[PDB]
């Protein structure tokens, strides 16, 4: 189906504890393929996905460390902030492609202290600035024609590498593993019981898991945990409903996932 390549970068100042830490992690869909950490004790043994086959590339991460440190200094000034506080700059960038490997869209956006700051628009030509601070960044990036450089990366390099990675890693990256499913039953009193619908061992993380009562969605009455990593590349999720004793067969569990040949409909037993 569709695929994404995305970098997730975090730069965090730590006054009195050295220069800001920079970490960059690259993903294809839900699979990490590269990491760079400016704090790494061994910068030579930093992890790579097994389907990766570089000095110039390490060099870009090292330059990006210095650039994010420049950014944090500028941001402190844009918000009139003291030298005493710790602050966080996050960035996300990369490309989405369809089943044919054609560009769907590009991304390049930033958050400061957990708030959206600036984003490259879907046109890959214009910026959306969240506030008067980000308007300074926007004017600087407009003056330097930065969007043209980001567009060239997102339409060219990013799409080309994602296509190469998907081919080289086709046995994993292009394999959807369906969820293994079961329903558990736990009385909570004489009057009520929990039905819990389990999905285990699935990849990618995207899944739909619901309870219905008499074929009506129980959105408000369903407890849905965040999808969570198992640590073997796969993900887990469950959904629970509290049901009156004896009414269990009115509830079904509905499971949608790319690895299933057909959506599942599960009842207790």
């Amino acid at each position: 189906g569709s695929h994404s390549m995305r970098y997730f970068d975090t730069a965090m100042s730590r006054p009195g504890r050295g220069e800001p830490r920079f970490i960059s992690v690259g993903y294809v869909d839900d699979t990490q393929f590269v990491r760079f950490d400016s704090d790494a004790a061994s910068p030579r043994e930093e992890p790579r996905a097994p389907w990766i086959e570089w000095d110039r590339n390490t060099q870009i991460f090292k330059t990006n460390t210095q650039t994010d440190r420049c950014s944090l200094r500028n941001l402190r000034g844009y918000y009139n902030q003291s030298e005493a506080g710790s602050h966080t700059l996050q960035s996300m960038y990369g490309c989405d492609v369809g089943p044919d490997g054609r560009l769907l869209r590009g991304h390049n956006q930033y958050a400061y202290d957990g708030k959206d700051y600036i984003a490259l628009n879907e046109d890959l030509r214009s910026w959306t600035a969240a506030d008067t601070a980000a308007q300074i960044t926007q004017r600087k990036w407009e003056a330097a024609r930065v969007a043209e450089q980001d567009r060239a990366y997102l339409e060219g390099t990013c799409v080309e590498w994602l296509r190469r990675y998907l081919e080289n890693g086709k046995d994993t990256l292009e394999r959807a593993d369906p969820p293994k499913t079961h329903v558990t039953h736990h009385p909570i009193s004489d009057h009520e019981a929990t039905l819990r619908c389990w999905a285990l061992g699935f990849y990618p993380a995207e899944i739909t898991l619901t309870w219905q009562r008499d074929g009506e969605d129980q959105t408000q009455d369903t407890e849905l945990v965040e999808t969570r990593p198992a640590g073997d590349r796969t993900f887990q999720k469950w959904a629970a409903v509290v049901v009156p004793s004896g009414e269990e067969q009115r509830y079904t569990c509905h499971v949608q996932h790319e690895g299933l040949p057909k959506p599942l409909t599960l009842r207790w037993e």
Partner: peptide, 9 residues
Amino acid sequence: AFAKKKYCL
């Protein structure tokens, strides 16, 4: 290459 050249904010 690995990653994108970044620009200072």
